[PDB]
Ligand binder design. Structure first.
Ligand SMILES: CC(C)(C)NC(=O)[C@@H]1C[C@@H]2CCCC[C@@H]2CN1C[C@@H](O)[C@H](Cc1ccccc1)NC(=O)[C@H](CC(N)=O)NC(=O)c1ccc2ccccc2n1
Ligand SMILES: [Cl-]
Lengths: 99, 99
């Protein structure tokens, strides 16, 4: 698909057996999901953005289906107001910015 | 151009006659620039991100070149860690996300 940016580039994802809405975010290093349980081990991390940092739990080798495209990678979980698909998974579905 | 996302999508911008580095950010509603002087009056705005909110100065109808493409629109100035080109100006340069 080609997505114009007049509005927020929101898509449906599947993660942990759950459907969620998420933002396709070229300005994010990481994939940050609102609080949910995920399988396997995790470790704590601090991630920063405008405003400062938040504490998250980092889970590795997590599969997410992103608007129909499967990708695997590290997902961090914590108190974000918006689920964001960052570059670590955007690369895996072949996403590019074009102008 | 076609910009992949293995690295941060950083480009050169020109604002106020000055060259700066900025991030092309589909996740950002607004364009946020590091402290600098800009002409005219400003109005207040609060912008929210991952760690919370920051106060910025909103300047309308600012001329800015982005990777060689001219945009004229709203920029907010404040204590951002990274200059961010958000959707308000990405649309003016005709940017799309594709996968
Ligand atoms: C810029 C503004 C207009 C305020 N918009 C936003 O911040 C919205 C807010 C939304 C609600 C909260 C959840 C995030 C979404 C998406 N974001 C956009 C989104 O693209 C945002 C833009 C950004 C990039 C760089 C630095 C700061 C801010 N990115 C991020 O928040 C990601 C989160 C992450 N760690 O992966 N940060 C970074 O990728 C990142 C990179 C370099 C940095 C250097 C110093 C300090 C912080 C740094 N953060
Ligand atoms: Cl990863």
């Amino acid at each position: 698909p080609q997505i114009t940016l007049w509005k927020r580039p929101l898509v449906t994802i599947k993660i942990g057996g759950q459907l969620k809405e998420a933002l396709l975010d070229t300005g994010a290093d990481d994939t940050v999901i609102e609080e949910m349980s995920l399988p396997g081990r995790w470790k704590p991390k601090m991630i920063g953005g405008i405003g400062g940092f938040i504490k998250v739990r980092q889970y590795d080798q997590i599969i997410i289906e992103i608007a129909g495209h499967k990708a695997i990678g590290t997902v961090v979980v914590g108190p974000t107001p918006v689920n964001i698909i960052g570059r670590n998974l955007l690369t895996q579905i072949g996403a590019t910015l074009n102008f």
